[PDB]
Design a protein around this nucleic acid. Sequence first.
DNA 1: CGCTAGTCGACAT
DNA 2: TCGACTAGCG
Length: 347
Amino acid sequence: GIQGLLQFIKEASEPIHVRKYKGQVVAVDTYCWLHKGAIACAEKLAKGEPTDRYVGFCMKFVNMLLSHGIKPILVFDGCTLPSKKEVERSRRERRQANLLKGKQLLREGKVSEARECFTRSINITHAMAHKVIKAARSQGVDCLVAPYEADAQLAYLNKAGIVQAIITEDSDLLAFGCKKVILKMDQFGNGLEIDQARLGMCRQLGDVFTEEKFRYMCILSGCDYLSSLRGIGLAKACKVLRLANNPDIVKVIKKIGHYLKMNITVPEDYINGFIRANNTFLYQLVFDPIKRKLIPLNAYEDDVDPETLSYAGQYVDDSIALQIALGNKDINTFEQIDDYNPDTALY
DNA sequence: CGCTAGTCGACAT
DNA sequence: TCGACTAGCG
Ligand SMILES: [Mn+2]
Ligand SMILES: [Mn+2]
Ligand SMILES: [Mn+2]
Ligand code: NA
C-alpha cells in the first residue's frame, strides 16, 4: 500500500459508474469487500459465533454488477508472501493485541471500547472467503484464488486482456501496472477511475509516467515490500527520478544524497531490498486461468536469474496450483476442502 | 513545504 | 485488504 498515492495523482482520476464496462469483464479485489462486510459483525467473529452476514454483503456488490451486464471475476488472496512476511507478522501481532485487549474489556463492562478493538482485530480467514466463493458460484460468477497476493493476480488479468478494469481500494495495483483501476466504489456502483495512460495529466509527475519509472517511485516512497528511507516520500522519490538522467536504477539510488542534496546513508541491504522488491512487483507468481499453470506476473528477462526469486513466491505443481486457485485446496492445511470442477458443466 | 506516525474510518440501525 | 486525516517534525 503506497500511502498518499491517490492524493498524489488526483489529476489523473475522474468519477465514473460501472455502466461504462457494460458487457465487459471486470476483476475484483474481493478481500476489500470481506473487510467491509465483517465490520457489521465483528463481535460475532471475535467470539467464534457463526455468522454469514459478510456473505450477503459481498453478494449485493456482485449482484449489482450482474444487473449492469458486468461479468465479475472475484479474485481472492492466497498464501503468504515471503516479501510480505514482515508486514503479515506485524498485522497478526496487532490483531492478537486488539483481540486480547478487547476480551479484557468484556471482563470489565466497557461494551463500546471492546467493540472498537474487535473491529480492529478482524482476521479474514480462508473459510470466510470460501463461503463467498460458494455463494458467488451459485449465481454463476467466476472465482479465482491467487497463488499469493491478489494484487499480482489482478495485474495479470488486466494486462493479459482477460479483464478490462480492476475494482479495488488498494493503490498497489497502479504500481503493478494495471491499465484501468476503479477506486472507492460504493454499493450503488460509483467510484473514481485512474487509467495508466492518463497518468500524464499529473504535472507533478513530470516524465515519471512510464510503467518502469512509476514503479520505481512507489518503492522509494515506501511499500509493503520495503520500508522507505527516513525522509523519502512520493514527492522526493518522484524528484529523484525526474532528475535521473540514467537508466541504471542502482546508481541513482546510491546518488540519492546528490539528487536531493541531503545527508542520506543507504545501507547495502537496502539496495538488495530494492532489487528484491522490484522483482516482486515484476515476477510475482500468478495463475494463468486459461492454460492453467504458474507463471510470473511479467515474463522473465535475460538480466534476471529466476533461481534468486524465492521471495516472490514458490512454484508448485500445476495440478496443485489449480486446486488452490479453484479454492478446493486449503491454503494452510493443503487439504481438499471442496470438490468443485469447472470442466463438468474464465477457464 | 514534504515526510512521519498515530488516529479514525470502512458497517449500519 | 487497505486508505483518509492531521499534528508534529525537518
Ligand atoms: Mn492474509
Ligand atoms: Mn493486496
Ligand atoms: Mn497491496
Ligand atoms: Na516514505
